[PDB]
Structures are given as C-alpha cells and as structure tokens.
Amino acid sequence: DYEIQRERIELGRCIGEGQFGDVHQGIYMSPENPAMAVAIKTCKNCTSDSVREKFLQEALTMRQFDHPHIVKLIGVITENPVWIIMELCTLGELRSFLQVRKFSLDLASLILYAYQLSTALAYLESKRFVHRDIAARNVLVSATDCVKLGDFLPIKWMAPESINFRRFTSASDVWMFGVCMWEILMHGVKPFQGVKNNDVIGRIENGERLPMPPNCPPTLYSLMTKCWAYDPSRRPRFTELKAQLSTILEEEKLQ
C-alpha cells in the first residue's frame, strides 16, 4: 500500500521544476519515522485523466527498481492534487550542482558521478529496461560523493536512430549516456549550444561529435566516442562502461 494520507505530509519549499509540475521538499510524518525528509512531485492539470495517468506511471516504474543510484519511491497521493512522494536528494539537480560547484569539484568527483550512473544503467540493462531520456537534468545529487538517476523531444541527447526512426533501445541509451558523461565533464553545460535542434542530425550524419571537454582524461573521451558509434551495434554495453569507468576513476584517484 503506497497510498499516503495527505495529512501525513507537510509540504515545504519548492526545490525545483519537474516535467509535470514543481518539486518540493517536505516532511512525512510516518509510522516508521515521525519526521522523514522527502521530495514531493506535483502535477498541474492533474484534473486531466490523461495527464494524471502519465504522471502516476513514473511512480509505477520507479517502484520496480531497487538500486543505490536510483531514487526510491516512498508513496503516492492519488486524489487531486496528485503527489508522488520520493526519497530526498538534498543537494538537488546535477546540472545546477555542477555549475555552482564548478571550481570546487575535482576531476575524481566528476568521474565518480559517471561511474555511479553507469552502475544504475547496468542494473536497468540487466532488467532489460530502456530509459529513453538519459541526461544530466534527470540526475539528482544526494551527497557530494553520491548521485542518483532521478526521473523516469531531447534531440541534442538522442541517438541518430532515435531521431530518424523514433527507435529506442539499450544501444540508444548508451548514446545518451555518452552525452551525459560529456555534460558532467563540462560542469553542466548543455551539448550543441547555439545549434537549432533541426540541424543536430545533419551534423551527426556528417560524422561530427561533441569535442573533448577541457581537463578530460583521454581514456574517458575515447569511451565517450565509442558510445557515439553511428551503428548502434558497435556501441559498448553498460557492463563494459562500468568496468572501464572504474579503472579510469582509480587512475585519477591514484595521482
């Protein structure tokens, strides 16, 4: 029974924006814990059956997973206004975090975040689950040493086959992960800035790729470039990415 009575939830400050509405922090006065810090996802136009259904589907999806680098579902309130109650990642969205701490965050921390994400994605791959929207905007920061996948057309992140034929696979997820790794190493700058979405595919087909971020180890950019193989069947799977990221992290930590 994931249904939570509204009176058990104290709605606190807005922490960020979300796909269907603002996300707030709050307190869940629960039997297990009289003052549990939580995140609360809201949904504007949840009076619309169509919108409610899509919104609440992410809670159903989240409930299927149990991994240290995937945010956990706590519960739902399914009467209007509909809320999703989630684990609170107290340092917020990854992009804003990287931008604000641009000159506090060392290279080892950025590599750790890519590794931790590869860990979540390998797990989703192991369950044959295709995410379709892997990007830094969908990652949350729980501690300075812990990020989590937080959210279940983003043309500038999408694999060629996704843009061309609306095809999404484990292989297209790896492409998107390549872009996310680039975002992290860029301290939260978006890919292809100043480029219109419609021109993105032309440049990919022409063989153009996002350049090596400053201070990015060559081993890591090489891994990114393998993620961006045009032929999906040449892209690595997450088990290899995870292994390689672990080695890269260690090298970085050793010196």
Cα separation, 245 vs 241, in Å, equals: 6
Alpha carbon dihedral 228, 146, 69, 155, in 10-degree steps, equals -30
State yes or no: 88 annotated in a binding site: yes
Method: X-ray
Helices then strands, each counted (H, E), the chain: 8, 7
Please answer whether residues 246 and 252 qualify as being in contact, where contact means their C-beta atoms are separated by less than 8 angstroms.
no
Same domain? For 78 and 129 the reply is no
Same domain? For 109 and 43 the reply is no
Cis peptide bond N-terminal to 236, omega within 30: no
Taking residue 42's Cβ as centre, other Cβ atoms within 10 Å add up to 18
Task: Please say which residue of 88, 108, 139 terminates a domain.
Answer: 88
Same domain? For 22 and 61 the reply is yes
State yes or no: 89 annotated in a binding site: yes
| Neighbour-count burial of 22, counting CB atoms closer than 10 A to its CB (0-12 exposed, 13-18 middle, 19+ buried) | middle
Catalytic (active-site) positions:
133
Nominal resolution (angstroms): 2.0
Q: Residues for the chain: how many in total?
A: 255
Cα separation, 26 vs 221, in Å, equals: 40
- The contacts of residue 198 (CB under 8 Å, 6+ apart) are none
Using a CB cutoff of 8 Å and minimum separation of 24, what contacts does 190-197 make? 190/156, 191/156, 191/157, 192/156, 195/156, 197/153, 197/155, 197/156
Q: What's the distance, Cα to Cα, between the start and end of the chain in Å?
A: 49
State yes or no: 201 annotated in a binding site: no
Parent domain of 54: 1-88
Task: Please say which residue of 65, 88, 111 terminates a domain.
Answer: 88
Please provide the DSSP assignment of 72-118 as one string: PEEEEE-SSSPEEEEE--TT-BHHHHHHHTTTT--HHHHHHHHHHHH
Same domain? For 170 and 245 the reply is yes
